[PDB]
Structures are given as C-alpha cells and as structure tokens.
Design a binder for these strands. Structure first.
Lengths: 255, 255
DNA sequence: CACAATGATCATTGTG
DNA sequence: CACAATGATCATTGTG
C-alpha cells in the first residue's frame, strides 16, 4: 500500500511538484550577452494541434505564462512512434551559448556506482517526475526562455515563457542535481546506515536488510513529498534485490 | 673553350656514359617476392608513334634489349607541353614493393647546403646527364624491369628490359648517389681545399678564388669524363659568384 | 592508366 | 527545422 501511505510523494496522487525550500533561480549571462530573437518557423496545423493540449495544461499549471520578451527561440514539434502524438521541444542552443558556464558537478554513472558497497543488497529505485519543473525560475530570468505561440484563430498575444527550470537549458541537470543534494542533506544525516545515490532525477537507495530498506524507502518518500518533489509510482522499484538503474542491472552486488 | 678541352666530359661531345669502375648492380628482392606480370594497357597509335623514336634510340644504345621475363610492368605515354611530344614512363610501383628496402643515404638539400662555408664564394654547378643510365644492371636483375613493346605491324617479339639503372625504380637515386661518392672519393682527397656537394646528379663545386675554381672545375670535369659520367654543357654554370642549385640562389654566401 | 595522398562535399545520427 | 559531429564519397594533385 505504498501509493497509499505517501499520497503526497507520488506524481499520480500528489499533483505537480514545487521545491518549496529552493529559492527562485537567477541565470547569470556572459558579460557580452545581448538578447537574441529567433523567428518561429511556420508550424503545420497537425503539429500545432498535437502540441496545443500540452501547452494548455502547462498554462493551467502556471508553468507557462504570457510575456513580451526581447528573447525568443524556436518551438519544434517532435513525434515519438512514427507519425502520431507530438510534444513541444524548444531549441535553446542560442540561449545556452549566451549563458555563463558553471562547473559540471553531476558525476558520471560509472563513478557514481563505485560508491555502492557489496554489503547493501536491498535496493529501492525512484524516478522523479518533471524534476526540472519543480525548481522555480526567478522573474528576472524568465524572459530569457520565451518562445512564440500561435493558436489557430483565437490565440494568446504571442510569446509565452517558463516560470520553472526548462528542458533544453544546458545547466538544468546540474542545477537540479545540486538543489536536490541540498534538500536531501539532512536526510542523509538521519540515515547514516543508508546509501543514497543521486543522478539528477534518478535515485538509488541501498540498505543492508529488507527492513532497513523498507524504513528507508518510507522516510525518503516522506521527505521527498514534504520537500515538493514527486516520484513516479509506475516505475518505482521498491525493496528489490535486483533493479534497473542508469542502464545497469544491479544484482547480488554486480555492476 | 670548356666544351673544347674536355670533350669526353660533356654529354654533347662525349656520347652516352658508362661508369666503368662500378660493378653491375644486383637488386635484392624481399624474402617473399614472386614475379608480378601486369598487362600492358592498349596504347593509341599517337602515343606509340610519339614514344617509338626514344625506344629505338635506347635499343641502338644497348640501354634496352629484347627479353622474355616472368616480370612485366606498364609503359605509360606522357606529354609535356599540352598535346605534342611524348616520352616513355614506366610504372614500377609493383616492382618497387617487391624489392628489399635500403637506408636512404641521400641528404636533404637543406642539410647538404649547411656544409658550405662563407669562405668559398666561387661556384661551378654541373648537372650530370642520364645519370642512372651510367650504372650497369647485372644480367640477373635485368628481367625484373621488363615491359611489353608493340610496334605497329613489324615489331620485336614483345618484351624489352633495361641493362642500366632505370627511371622509376625506388632505389635509383640512392644507389647512384653512393656510386658517385665512391668514384669521387679520391678526387676529394686531391683537392682538400675544394668543397664538393653531391645530390644524386646535381653537383656543386666551391672554391675560395676564381682561379682555384677554374683549376677545380677542370680537374672535376676531367675526372668525371674519365670515370664514364657526362655533364650537361647547356646548363653548366661555371666559375660564377652566383648560381642556381637545388632550387636555391647562391650569392655572396646566402641560402 | 593506375593509385596513394589530401582536400572537399555529402550524408547521416543525435539533438535542442 | 537548424546544427554540431562523425562518417562516407568524390574530386583533385602528384606520380610511377
């Protein structure tokens, strides 16, 4: 009854997230950066119709809001199967080139895994849902990510932008990874015996016994939930001695 | 009256050369080499007609002779201006790959020139004519360089080969350079004060005074002539304080 | 004519 | 759609 005891921790029963302890992000620009406004390539009705629902939902969630900005990057329509179902993908390369670089602190999967003793054989793997969106963007940095949105006939002014850390931004993974490390610091202190691996939105909890794991998984879910993050119940691999994590198959302490 | 005192030293007044002190060359093959017989690409009458005179002259000079050999490489027709005058060029790449390598002892022009003191300002530059042909090829190595020759209607059997070091053979420059160094050794001993630079068939004699140079040039011409080599009177740059040598312009002791 | 060497274009895969 | 990255082909220069 996991999806029952921690309703607030699951993306399916807790609604979209928001990292309440994290201050709104300010994105510093390179010293010589000036706004770049790139035209929106015309978009076929089919693509637009495929994308519209996502846009509306994001507007309803306040993740997207209207705006007028000297910045503008293309919105691209991408399909998955072979022709159906679309999803909005923004080309932020021209923006990324104008943002000041930061040191990449996200460890590579290989080194991240080396810190997993053969002693902890019980695993609980969690995937955070819409991780980036949980981090708010400061009003001053929001304009930076604007894009044009046209609705068939009756459509909002023109530009929309994000109020949360967006997909496609070169520093999102790193900024999220550091934010979550700050939010789970105390938790690591209350569970000295537990092993916690973080790779952006992919989490691995390791325990010595199936029980410690159970108690660990509960405390983690409860902590993530109260902090404003959401884990995916559908993918959640709880208290297993074998799990899939970052492309590896963990079992008996191998890989 | 240079072209007069040493008639035997000039290609124009001494006839084709022959290094009388040099034993006929034996060309060692790599341990796994087997004869390679490459077909002769058909040759247009025009090309053949352009090449015929050279072939006949070489046969008359005994530089080419009939033969039957398990080896055979293509003869190619090459023009210089833009359409007229041809000349026979043999593709010996398949043969060169089957011949045992030797250490390249010919110094590069740059290092060769460093050994020219600023003290010797009088130069005499000589170009040996048909240098390679002056070295005989041992009967055992002759078959190696065979090629097919067809004359319009009345033409010799088919294959012809060389009795002298051929053009296109990868070791010709080096073998010639070493042969001439052996033949001019004593000469360098009788003229300790003279500076002699050898680059295959390109020779540079350096003297301190215009006279020593004159006496040097005479002794060199006389020695080359008696040894069987031939210098080109047309290009001969005698006792000059400025000369062209290996792409450089020597003057006042520069370059 | 055949070919080793460079240089130039194209084509393709992964992506924002 | 635009593009950085690789990989693949072609084209060209020098030559035997």
């Amino acid at each position: 009854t996991w999806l029952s005891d921690f309703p607030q921790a699951w993306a399916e029963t807790g609604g979209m997230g928001l990292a309440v302890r994290q201050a709104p992000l300010i994105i510093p620009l390179k010293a010589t950066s000036t706004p770049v406004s790139i035209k929106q390539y015309p978009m076929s009705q089919e693509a637009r119709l495929g994308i519209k629902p996502h846009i509306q939902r994001l507007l309803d969630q306040g993740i997207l809001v209207p705006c007028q900005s000297p910045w503008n990057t293309p919105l691209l329509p991408v399909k998955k199967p072979g022709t159906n179902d679309y999803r909005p993908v923004q080309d932020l390369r021209e923006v990324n080139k104008r943002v000041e670089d930061i040191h990449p602190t996200v460890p590579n999967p290989y080194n991240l895994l080396s810190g997993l003793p053969p002693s902890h054989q019980w695993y609980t793997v969690l995937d955070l849902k819409d991780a980036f969106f949980c981090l708010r963007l400061h009003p001053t940095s929001q304009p930076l990510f604007a894009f044009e949105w046209r609705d068939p006939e009756m459509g909002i002014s023109g530009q929309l932008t994000w109020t949360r850390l967006p997909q496609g931004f070169k520093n999102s993974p790193t900024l999220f990874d550091e934010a979550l490390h700050r939010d789970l610091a105390d938790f690591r202190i209350q569970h000295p015996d537990l092993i916690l691996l973080q790779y952006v939105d992919d989490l691995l909890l390791a325990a010595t016994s199936e029980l410690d794991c159970q108690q660990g998984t509960r405390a983690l879910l409860q902590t993530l939930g109260n902090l404003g993050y959401r884990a995916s119940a559908k993918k959640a691999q709880i208290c297993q001695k074998q799990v899939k994590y970052l492309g590896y198959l963990l079992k008996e302490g191998q890989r």
